[PDB]
Design a protein around this ligand. Structure first.
Ligand SMILES: N[C@@H](Cc1cc(I)c(Oc2cc(I)c(O)c(I)c2)c(I)c1)C(=O)O
Length: 250
């Protein structure tokens, strides 16, 4: 009985309703499925040679593995019924919007402080420099700084999945038709996410506000990548652009 605000005047911290656990199980599984190499990534990963890394040899490695990265985000979305409930133009609009946001999140949570690397596609471990010089520029710094910061959040697969869901259901992308409906699905994810955090009892003060701030930072990564993507088309050759890469980023 979502009295919600009232339960937040008394100071109780509401856990997930029965319906919310269902939504949480769906999003979680969507993610775990489409997350290249689940919990097995730290030993499955080849460090890219110190000598590689606009440095074009670098770029070519990242573009080689980017089409599967993209598609595993479309797959994450497909596995959300709310996404299925939307028109075809809206779906494409939402994906193009969140694709880098999600991929960046997936990379940043595989930050390893021992090596100072992130791991892409669960397949390849890069440094900040290698990722910067291979085309991202300062978006690399953005992602590394983020990964470094999410170290203390200790996110679990559910937390990352819900974050992905919040990024996907963004009502402000341009061109959308079903805005109010996307906002409602969003609010539904945020409400379950908060609830799930209450349940997790993280030992960090002001955990939720803090994690919402990361949504923004992800958004910024994405914006900033759009711009990097123009700087790229002029520097690297139309040749090394996987078709799907082009179609998502336009
Ligand atoms: N690790 C994620 C996927 C992921 C793949 C790549 I490859 C990547 O790096 C780039 C590099 C360039 I250059 C681009 O132009 C773009 I978009 C992404 C990032 I960050 C994330 C996953 O597990 O799903």
């Amino acid at each position: 009985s979502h009295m919600e605000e009232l339960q937040k005047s008394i100071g109780h911290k509401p856990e997930p309703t029965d319906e919310e656990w269902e939504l949480i199980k769906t999003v979680t599984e969507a993610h775990v499925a489409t997350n290249a190499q689940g919990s097995h990534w730290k030993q499955k990963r080849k460090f890219l040679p110190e000598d590689i890394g606009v440095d074009l040899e670098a770029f070519s490695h990242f573009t080689k593995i980017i089409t599967p990265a993209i598609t595993r985000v479309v797959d994450f979305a497909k596995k959300l019924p709310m996404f299925c409930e939307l028109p075809c133009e809206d779906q494409i609009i939402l994906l193009k919007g969140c694709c880098m946001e999600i991929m960046s999140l997936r990379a940043a949570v595989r930050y390893d402080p021992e090596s100072e690397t992130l791991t892409l596609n669960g397949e390849m471990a890069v440094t900040r420099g290698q990722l910067k010089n291979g085309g991202l520029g300062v978006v690399s710094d953005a992602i590394f700084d983020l990964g470094m910061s999410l170290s203390s959040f200790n996110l679990d697969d559910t937390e990352v999945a819900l974050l992905q869901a919040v990024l996907l259901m963004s009502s402000d992308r341009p061109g959308l038709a079903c805005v109010e409906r996307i906002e409602k699905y969003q609010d539904s994810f945020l409400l379950a996410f908060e609830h799930y955090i209450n349940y997790r009892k993280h030992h960090v003060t002001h955990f939720w506000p803090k994690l919402l701030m990361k949504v923004t930072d992800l958004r910024m990564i994405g914006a900033c990548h759009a711009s990097r993507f123009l700087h790229m088309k002029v520097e690297c050759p139309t040749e090394l652009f996987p078709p799907l890469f082009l179609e998502v980023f336009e």
